Write a protein that binds this ligand. Sequence first.
Ligand code: NAG
Ligand code: NA
Lengths: 256, 64, 40
Amino acid sequence: IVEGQDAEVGLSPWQVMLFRKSPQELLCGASLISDRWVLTAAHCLLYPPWDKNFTVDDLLVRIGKHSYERKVEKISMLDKIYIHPRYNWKENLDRDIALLKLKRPIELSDYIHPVCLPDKQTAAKLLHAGFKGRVTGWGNRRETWTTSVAEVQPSVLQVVNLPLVERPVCKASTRIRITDNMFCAGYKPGEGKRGDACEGDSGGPFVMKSPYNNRWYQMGIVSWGEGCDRDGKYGFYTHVFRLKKWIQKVIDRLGS
Amino acid sequence: VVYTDXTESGQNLXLCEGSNVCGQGNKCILGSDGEKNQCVTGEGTPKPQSHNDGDFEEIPEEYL
Amino acid sequence: PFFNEKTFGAGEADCGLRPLFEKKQVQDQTEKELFESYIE
Ligand SMILES: *[C@@H]1O[C@H](CO)[C@@H](O)[C@H](O)[C@H]1NC(C)=O
Ligand code: NA
């Protein structure tokens, strides 16, 4: 998270870190949507250009983390990986969505609690240019560094609040083909403010709070960016609501 | 994924011309000093993934 | 329930309500900003 702040404890109890087993390292963000299911981006799991295709033995997820925070964080193995069948990494990450099933259901706590997924009304009410959502993750505090990556890495979970940007403005900001499965968010140059997702935040959630029911909803998954926090550029995010039918399919399949 | 600046000629899936990704099917000719970079048709090598955050405390051996 | 609880698990009914915030009728440090964006 570029230009964000230390999150308060318990701010984002649905926050999940995806972790490689050996070597131990942060791979991506993710979110908790039930006691048993975790949402992330496809590209966190499958990405041919980097020769990346993880199996369940390669990965752990970590939940309830603020900074090993024992008696507060839960580490879980994965039972199964599900990647959207029409995930198009060849072009520019159309349908960048994946579900991970936890080996075993976890207990909820002050620090562990699922986010809501949007429905039709939620999307219609909340997705308007200028409405601000919120991005959280453990990724780089800056796109580049002088000496070492270590220098831009946060000690605690970062948060930033960023506004949805108009589709035409999103399309005008880049030459990449934008689809209906994506949206962009961020401040225009010469707005008063800055901020963006950056390396190690991808797969993490873009949430919005409903005024109507006081509940948090994941409208987005951090998907892609040209740089982090560059002027005239915007973060792009998987449109979760538009892909909800696939989410339902996977979860409602018998013996999933 | 974040597309960052190409660091050697021949790379793709990185920022080549200004803040624009140079995509698959293309490769990035790095300008020397005073030269612009050029994204051209050709086979490119993806800019490698940067060394991830591997700085955490060790977790129980049970989780292997 | 949008998901069958049998395959989805527990969590849908109580989702999006944080134990350290909403459950306690307490606001986080920046959520006011989010609501201002809807109103102003
Ligand atoms: C993904 O890996 C699995 C091996 O579990 C395989 O079934 C599938 O065909 C792979 N896809 C790619 C692009 O390697
Ligand atoms: Na920007």
